[PDB]
Structure formats: structure tokens, C-alpha cells
Amino acid sequence: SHMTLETTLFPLEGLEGLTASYQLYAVKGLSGLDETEYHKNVNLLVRRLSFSMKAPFVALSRDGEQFIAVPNYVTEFPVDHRVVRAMVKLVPTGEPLNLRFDAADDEYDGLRLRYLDFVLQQPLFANHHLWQPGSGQPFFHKKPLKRLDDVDLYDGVSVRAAKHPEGGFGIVCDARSKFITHTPIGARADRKRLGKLINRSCLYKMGDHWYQFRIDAVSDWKVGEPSLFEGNVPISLAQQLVRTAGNAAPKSIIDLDPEGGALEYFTSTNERRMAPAELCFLIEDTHGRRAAKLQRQTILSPSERRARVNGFIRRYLSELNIGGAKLSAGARAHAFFTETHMPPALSFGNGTVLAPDTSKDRFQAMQEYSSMRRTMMLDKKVGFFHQDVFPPQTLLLPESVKKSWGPAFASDFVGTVQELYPAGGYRPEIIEYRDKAYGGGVPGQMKALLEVAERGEIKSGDVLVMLHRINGAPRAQDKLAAMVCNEFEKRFGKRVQVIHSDSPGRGYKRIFKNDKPTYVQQRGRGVNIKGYLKGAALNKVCLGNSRWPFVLRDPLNADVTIGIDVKNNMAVFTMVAEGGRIVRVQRSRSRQREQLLESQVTQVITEMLSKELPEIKKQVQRVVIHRDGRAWPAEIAGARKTFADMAESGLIAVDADVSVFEVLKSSPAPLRLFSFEEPTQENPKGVINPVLGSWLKLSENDGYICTTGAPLLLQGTADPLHVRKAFGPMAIEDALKDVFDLSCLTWPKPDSCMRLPLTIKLCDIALF
Numbered sequence: 001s002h003m004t005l006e007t008t009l010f011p012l013e014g015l016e017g018l019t020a021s022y023q024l025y026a027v028k029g030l031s032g033l034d035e036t037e038y039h040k041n042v043n044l045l046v047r048r049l050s051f052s053m054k055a056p057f058v059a060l061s062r063d064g065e066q067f068i069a070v071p072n073y074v075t076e077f078p079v080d081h082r083v084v085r086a087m088v089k090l091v092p093t094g095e096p097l098n099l100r101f102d103a104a105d106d107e108y109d110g111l112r113l114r115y116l117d118f119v120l121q122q123p124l125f126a127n128h129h130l131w132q133p134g135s136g137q138p139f140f141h142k143k144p145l146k147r148l149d150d151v152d153l154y155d156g157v158s159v160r161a162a163k164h165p166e167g168g169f170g171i172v173c174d175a176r177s178k179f180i181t182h183t184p185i186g187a188r189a190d191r192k193r194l195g196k197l198i199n200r201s202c203l204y205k206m207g208d209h210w211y212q213f214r215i216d217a218v219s220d221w222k223v224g225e226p227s228l229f230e231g232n233v234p235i236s237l238a239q240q241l242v243r244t245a246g247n248a249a250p251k252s253i254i255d256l257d258p259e260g261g262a263l264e265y266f267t268s269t270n271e272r273r274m275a276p277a278e279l280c281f282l283i284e285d286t287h288g289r290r291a292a293k294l295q296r297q298t299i300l301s302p303s304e305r306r307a308r309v310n311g312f313i314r315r316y317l318s319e320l321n322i323g324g325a326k327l328s329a330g331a332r333a334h335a336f337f338t339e340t341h342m343p344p345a346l347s348f349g350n351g352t353v354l355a356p357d358t359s360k361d362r363f364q365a366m367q368e369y370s371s372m373r374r375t376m377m378l379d380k381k382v383g384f385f386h387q388d389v390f391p392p393q394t395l396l397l398p399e400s401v402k403k404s405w406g407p408a409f410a411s412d413f414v415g416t417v418q419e420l421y422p423a424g425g426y427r428p429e430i431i432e433y434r435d436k437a438y439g440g441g442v443p444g445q446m447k448a449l450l451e452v453a454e455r456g457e458i459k460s461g462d463v464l465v466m467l468h469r470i471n472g473a474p475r476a477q478d479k480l481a482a483m484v485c486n487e488f489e490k491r492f493g494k495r496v497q498v499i500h501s502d503s504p505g506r507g508y509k510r511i512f513k514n515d516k517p518t519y520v521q522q523r524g525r526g527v528n529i530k531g532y533l534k535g536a537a538l539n540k541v542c543l544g545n546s547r548w549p550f551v552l553r554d555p556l557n558a559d560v561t562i563g564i565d566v567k568n569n570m571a572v573f574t575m576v577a578e579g580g581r582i583v584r585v586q587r588s589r590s591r592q593r594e595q596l597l598e599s600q601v602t603q604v605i606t607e608m609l610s611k612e613l614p615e616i617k618k619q620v621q622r623v624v625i626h627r628d629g630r631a632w633p634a635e636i637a638g639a640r641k642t643f644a645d646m647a648e649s650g651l652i653a654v655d656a657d658v659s660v661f662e663v664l665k666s667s668p669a670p671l672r673l674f675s676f677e678e679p680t681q682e683n684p685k686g687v688i689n690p691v692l693g694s695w696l697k698l699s700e701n702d703g704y705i706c707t708t709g710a711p712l713l714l715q716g717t718a719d720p721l722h723v724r725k726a727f728g729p730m731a732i733e734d735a736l737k738d739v740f741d742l743s744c745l746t747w748p749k750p751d752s753c754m755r756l757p758l759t760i761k762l763c764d765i766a767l768f
Contacts (some may be wrong), residue, residue: 002362005675005690007335008309009317009698010171011164014326021099021108021115023166025067025078029088031459035634036595039065045082048133048269068097068111081598093287100639101169105700113162116169119322120161127316131210133203135268136160138176146297151181151284153297158446159311160669163699164334171317171329174670175308179284181293185224187260187278194261194277202263202280207245207253212283213265213275223276224258235276237262242373250278273316273571288473292620299716303687306674340706341693343369344741345549346581352382352454353553358503362691366711373750377549384421385581386547391397391427392460393541396452398435401501402464404444405508406430409517416533421542427462436466442470442480449484453492462520464540478570481768489587497540498768503527539748549747552579557730558624558659559616562605563630563759564635566590573604574762577616580745584608585766595632602638604643606645613651619655624730626759627659631726636660638725659728661735663760671696671704689718695736701725705736707743721755 030038042065047069050057059067061644067090077092079138084460099112106112115134124139131142140156155174164170180203185194201214219226226234230243237436241253261277283668286294300308310333343366345355354372357365376382395413397406410430417426433452438444441768445468452458465488481498507529509522517734522531542549556579563574571590576583591597613620623643643658673694679686692709704720723739725732742757754761 002675003340004335004336004337004693005673006306007696007697008173008306008541008672009164010173010313010332011166011188011330011334012168012170013328013330014163014324015101015169017100018324018326019098019100020324021068021097021111022071023069023095023598024097025069026091027064027066027088027154028091028112029082029086030064034592036592036632039632041071041086041088043166044270045572049081050118050653051135051269056115058114058118062107069094071096075503081556089375101176102167105163107165109699120317120320120327121159122317122322123320124159128208130316133178133212137212138178139165140176140178147182148297151179151294153309154178156473157309158670159317160336162669162702165336165696166202166334167700169411170334171313172669173303173309173313174672175228175300177300177318179286179294181282181284183281185261185277185280185282187257187276189261189277190262191218191261194263197282198440199283201283203283205252205279205281207241207250208273208360213629215263216266217603219262219274221262222258222570223256223260223262223278227274237276239348239473281723285473285475286473294306302674302689302717303683303685305672305717306687309672318344319653336696338695339693340691341737341740343693343744344551346373346744347385347553348376348550349383349385349387350381352376355549355553363711366692370712370746370753371751372590375394375748376419377750380422384423384542384549385551386548387421388547388584390421390541390545392427394460394463395428395430396449396456396458396463396465397430397432398434398466398468398501399528400435402430402432405505405510405519406432407507407597408521409504412521412529412533413537414538416561417541420534420537421547422593422712424545424547426541429459440468442483445470446483446487447479450487453488453494458492459493461493461499462495462498462545466499466501468501478556482570486570489591499536499540502531503532515601535749541746547582548580548583549750550745551581552741552745555579556741557734558622558738559618559620560609561624561626561738561742561757561759561761563626563628563757563761564596564601564765565626565767566592566594566596570594570767571596571600571604572763573608573765574766575608575612576759577612580613580758582615583762585762586610587766594629596635598634598638601635602642605638605642609646610651619653620651621656622730623656623658624735626757627662627726628665628763629662631660636727658728659730659735660726662724662726663739663757664724664757665760670722672717673704673706673720673755675710689713693740694719694720695733695740697733697736700732703732703736705740705743707740707757708755709752719755 042059046057046059055070059065078092082088099108101112121197125132129142130139133137138156138158140154144152145155146153156178158174158176161171195218199213201212202210203210224235224238229235238256238258245253245701252759256276256278261653262274263277263280264274267273310631311328313331320327343356345353354376356369377384395410395439414426433448435445438447465484470480485496487494506526507521508519510517511520560577565572570588571588574585588604625639639660642656643652643656646652647656673690674687675690677686677688689710690706692706692708692711694709697703702724704722706718723735732752739757742759743754745758746752746754
């Protein structure tokens with residue numbers, strides 16, 4: 001009975017008969033709107049309405065955005081809102097909307113949820129042992145869980161609570177972690193130490209009011225010095241933290257050193273405000289500093305993460321009173337039986353097909369399958385699906401590295417390519433650029449790369465360039481990698497791939513051989529250079545030249561899908577047709593930061609398709625889109641317009657049906673799924689990961705797939721992937737099923753489980 005899987009969905013009781021929703025308004029200042037700016041207006045405004053008037057102000061509508069008030073407001077000031085900036089008139093079309101939490105699935109299921117959500121964390125914000133970093137964030141203890149030299153580990157739980165699959169509403173929970181340094185920033189921290197920190201985030205322990213904020217400006221006054229005025233008499237912020245302090249106000253908040261730093265930041269509603277440096281505690285960004293003995297702490301075995309969540313539910317959310325003081329969370333999670341998805345069968349080269357076996361208990365048969373994807377890809381009887389010779393290549397090397405270990409590395413690297421893709425016959429020209437001549441920063445490195453390209457020294461179409469790493473942290477993003485791709489593709493005719501000098505320059509030493517210096521490999525600490533050469537041959541060369549190793553024999557529900565991602569004013573569109581036999585990626589620049597226009601979406605896709613349409617050997621009649629993040633209604637506009645138009649021409653059946661979906665890799669309402677194993681000694685309550693194809697549908701618009709799961713996880717607990725329906729006619733169970741199939745095309749690392757579907761995974765590697 002392994003199929004029996006428990007969730008972190010706790011049923012909710014006490015809302016049977018709790019209709020509490022009652023009104024409606026309408027927007028009028030939108031006369032100049034952006035199709036993307038208009039939606040930053042509302043949000044800044046519902047916050048001021050929810051946070052000033054401190055009752056539930058909820059706003060989640062279609063087309064022209066609308067707001068729910070309570071009839072209980074004293075004086076709303078409807079036409080008197082942002083008379084400061086734009087003057088929206090809040091037209092009261094208020095029809096009493098009285099929502100019940102058992103109704104059939106309605107469009108104001110969106111509102112029934114943002115209301116439940118505002119009021120269910122009032123008993124959590126008023127607790128005292130519990131602090132919330134910001135609006136709608138997990139709820140963390142004031143007390144840390146581990147001490148952990150220099151820096152405190154705080155545990156917590158995220159509670160969001162959307163629809164239930166056996167009717168009604170319920171609770172969703174995930175544990176969480178957060179790393180904060182032990183000892184406040186301090187009142188003998190000077191001006192230069194304080195600047196060195198603008199735009200980190202700190203935990204500001206105010207009084208009993210603990211929250212999080214990002215630095216903006218080391219202020220112009222110290223803690224004691226008079227800066228703002230309550231009576232025009234400047235008063236010192238020590239004075240201000242007293243005025244706003246409460247009865248038994250703690251010691252720290254009324255005995256600050258006046259000779260200490262003061263920081264600035266902007267409220268959740270965009271107000272300027274200060275905070276003493278004493279009382280501010282910096283959050284370790286442990287992906288910023290590669291603290292991999294600080295990541296070996298955030299990974300939580302399954303039976304823990306269950307026990308942490310169950311413990312939090314029983315201890316904090318039980319007696320729970322807001323007006324209607326009912327609504328007790330039922331403190332036994334949701335469980336179902338379900339059928340888990342088998343892996344798809346796949347097509348390797350010379351028509352040999354891998355299909356999972358259905359005699360072996362699911363487990364032993366999938367480790368078989370997932371290892372086959374590698375052994376088959378390498379085996380020369382079968383091997384790559386697409387076998388053919390490579391068109392001309394070019395490996396482009398820093399001249400500092402052509403003279404030191406270039407040749408050894410290039411020799412091994414070409415060797416590695418031919419033992420992986422023998423049919424290609426790899427043989428790349430070896431060009432160089434003069435990495436020491438001009439500058440050594442991103443400009444200059446670029447001037448040398450461009451100067452070489454100018455000369456026409458790069459014959460051939462496809463290139464692989466080796467570059468240098470300029471700055472640390474993963475949030476930096478290599479502006480140089482991206483920019484070499486941009487210029488090389490756009491001004492010259494090139495499809496470019498990128499590796500970096502640092503990583504192989506670890507795997508080569510100089511030994512002295514036969515009266516000459518010579519470079520040979522090394523395998524000590526550092527990088528595993530045999531594995532690195534293998535993986536970079538596959539990713540940068542075989543995939544870089546669009547030679548797919550294995551491609552999904554049997555068809556998906558969609559006939560075409562399309563990833564989309566915009567981050568840092570760059571948009572990325574992928575496209576997967578046939579079984580994976582047809583794949584494109586295209587890049588184009590986005591006027592909005594992360595948002596994309598609607599004329600641009602309609603165009604990029606009508607041009608990226610129609611190139612490939614003759615190869616698609618069907619009438620094409622079920623298209624899907626996957627969006628990385630929020631799918632803004634600008635985008636969804638052109639999405640149907642694109643395919644409606646192709647429904648006229650004849651490129652499609654006339655009855656096409658497009659569908660938009662949002663893949664939440666950072667899921668707004670997270671969840672875990674477990675299942676069980678006779679409690680062994682080791683494991684008191686016998687909690688393992690759910691088996692790899694496990695899936696769960698809550699609503700018609702929300703479900704989770706295990707793209708990562710039991711047989712092939714290496715350690716930790718599996719993170720179900722939250723997808724959310726956004727438009728269009730496709731069964732969400734079908735969408736989850738072939739998002740799982742698209743996540744079994746594990747191209748960059750075959751024997752491993754990949755969490756994202758191939759569509760949006762390429763969106764993420766394509767912008768590094």
C-alpha cells in the first residue's frame with residue numbers, strides 16, 4: 001500500500017456558515033496605464049488600505065482591477081484616495097458580495113482566499129514568540145533553533161491555506177529556515193563600516209515588533225540626534241522609540257547609545273523611516289557566501305519536516321479567535337490514495353526504446369530506468385537519438401591560457417567529446433583573444449573579444465568561448481557571459497556557448513616530463529576534472545549543437561508547449577514539439593523589467609513558429625504555454641491572439657485551444673507530500689519521500705507534481721512543483737501529467753531527477 005500519501009493540507013472547521021465578504025468598488029484613475037504599470041498601482045494601494053485601516057482589504061480581479069471593502073469602515077474616503085499622485089475615483093458599484101466558504105467553485109474563490117488569509121495571521125502577528133519578516137511571509141520563532149558559530153538559525157513555518165479537494169477550505173504548511181547573525185550591528189559601527197552594507201537585509205528587533213528590512217541610506221543623524229519633529233522641535237528617534245513604546249517597554253528600546261549608527265529603509269507602503277544600528281542584525285545571504293556547511297543545516301529529513309509542521313500546528317494555530325471565533329485547524333493532515341505516473345518511454349538512437357518495467361516494484365525499476373538513460377546514451381550500439389557530423393566549430397581561448405594549459409585541456413576536451421558523441425567527429429579551430437592587453441575588467445575583455453570577432457578570426461557558425469569570472473555571488477550574474485552572447489549573436493552570425501577559465505584551471509598541474517614542462521590532469525581537492533570535461537562536453541557541445549540524446553517516444557497531451565521567462569529586461573522563449581524532437585530557444589529584449597509586452601509576445605511566437613511548422617507532421621491542435629512566474633494579462637492577450645490568427649490561416653486545425661499555466665518554482669502556497677515505511681528504529685514515524693510520479697490536485701486551478709521524488713532523491717525532502725492554471729481549456733491533471741513527462745527529459749544530467757520541465761529549465765540555463 002505504498003501509494004497512500006499524506007500531505008501538509010490540514011482541513012479547516014468553523015467556516016461552515018461564515019459568509020463575511022459584503023462589498024465592492026471600482027477603479028477610475030487608469031486613463032494612463034501601461035498594461036503592466038497599472039498593476040503596481042493597485043498593489044501599493046491595497047496595502048495602504050489594508051495596513052492603515054487594519055482590517056482585510058482584498059483585491060484579486062480580472063480586467064480593470066476592483067477592491068473589496070467591509071461595510072464597516074466609519075469613513076472610507078472613496079474619491080479621496082491618492083489625490084496626492086494620480087487621483088483614482090473609487091466608484092462604489094458595491095453590490096453586497098457575501099461569500100461562503102463551501103460554495104461551488106466560483107471566480108470569487110480568489111477572494112474567499114485572500115480574506116481567509118488576512119485574518120488567519122492576526123492570531124499569529126499578535127502572538128509574542130512569533131515574528132513575521134514582512135507581509136505574507138513564513139512565521140518564525142523569536143527563539144533560534146541552533147547556535148552555529150557567528151550566526152543564528154531561526155526556524156519557522158509558512159501558512160497560506162487555499163482550497164481543499166474534498167470540498168471547502170483548509171491549511172497548507174511547509175517548514176522553512178532563515179540565517180541571521182548573532183550579534184547586532186552596533187553603536188560603535190562607524191560611517192564607512194555602515195555604508196559597506198547598503199542593500200543587505202537585517203532583522204530589526206524593534207521592541208516586541210520584529211521585522212525585516214533592506215538598507216537604503218546610512219542616515220544623516222546618529223541615534224540621539226534630532227532629525228524629525230513631533231511639535232517642530234526635532235526629536236531624536238531615541239525620543240521617538242520611547243513615544244511609540246508600550247508600558248513594559250523592553251530595556252533595549254529606551255536605553256540606546258546616542259553615539260551609534262542609524263539606518264534607513266522604506267515601509268511596505270513606501271514611507272521613509274529609520275532604525276538604530278544597535279538593534280539591527282544582518283541576514284547571512286548564504287548563497288552570496290558559499291556557506292556549504294551552512295547549507296548542510298537547512299536540509300531536513302522527511303520525518304523531521306513533518307514533525308516540525310505538526311508541532312507548529314498543534315501549538316499555535318489551535319484556539320483561534322477573530323470576531324467569528326470558530327475555525328480550528330483540524331490537526332490531522334490530508335491523505336489520499338493515488339496512482340502515481342510512470343516515467344514515459346523514450347527513443348534513443350538506432351530506434352532502441354527505453355520503457356520502465358512494470359513487474360519490479362516501482363522503486364527498483366526506476367533506478368533501473370534512470371541509470372539506463374546514461375548507459376544507453378553512451379553505449380555505441382545505441383547512443384544518441386540524433387547522430388550526425390558536427391558542422392564546423394571554434395574553441396576560443398584566453399591567450400593567457402593558450403600558453404599555459406590550453407593545449408592539454410583542449411586535447412582532453414576534444415577527446416571527451418568524441419567518446420560521448422562519436423558520430424560528430426569533433427575537431428574545433430583554436431582561436432584566442434588577447435585577454436591581458438586591454439583592461440582586465442568586463443570592458444576590455446570585451447574589447448579583445450570584439451576585436452577578434454571584427455577581424456573575422458571566427459570562421460564557422462558555432463563557438464564556445466572560455467571567459468574569466470569577474471565578481472562573486474550568484475545574484476551578481478555574469479554580465480560578461482550574457483554580453484558576449486548578445487554581441488556575438490546579434491552583430492556576427494554566431495551561436496555561442498560559454499565556459500570559464502577558473503574551473504579547468506584547477507584540474508591541471510605542470511609536471512616535468514622528458515626534459516620539458518607539460519600539463520597533466522590532477523584529482524586532489526578542487527574540481528573533478530574528468531567529470532567536468534564529461535559534463536561540459538555534453539552540455540556546451542552536444543546540446544549546444546542541438547543533438548538531443550533521447551526524446552519521448554509517445555506523444556504528450558499538448559502538441560506544442562512554450563516556456564517563457566523574463567528577468568533583467570531579457571525575455572527567453574523555448575519551444576518543445578514532437579517528442580522533444582523539435583526544440584528552439586530564442587532571446588529578445590523586454591522593455592518592462594520582468595513583464596514583456598503583448599505585441600511582442602504575439603510576434604516572437606508567430607515568427608519562432610511557422611519556421612518549425614512544416615516539420616510538425618500533425619495538424620497542431622493543443623498548444624500550451626508555461627510561464628516562469630506570474631503570467632501578466634498583457635502576455636495572455638497575445639497568447640490567444642497568436643493562435644487565433646493561425647486558426648484563420650490554416651497552420652492549425654480551426655479549433656485550436658491554447659492554455660496558459662504558471663510554474664511556481666517558488667510556490668506562493670507550498671506543500672510537502674509524504675508516504676511511509678514500517679517505522680524502523682532509525683525513523684520513529686517511518687516517513688520517506690513520495691514516489692517520483694506522485695501528484696495532487698486541490699482545485700481545478702492548482703496542483704502539485706513530484707518531479708523529484710523517492711527512488712532518485714539524494715538527500716532532503718522532495719519539493720512538489722506548484723503549477724497554477726491561468727487560462728484555457730486544458731484539464732489540469734493532463735497539464736501536471738506532461739509537466740512530469742517534460743521533466744523526465746533529463747538532458748543536462750541523465751541519471752538524476754530534474755525538478756523543472758524541459759521548457760522552463762531551458763529558460764533558466766539560457767540566461768545563466
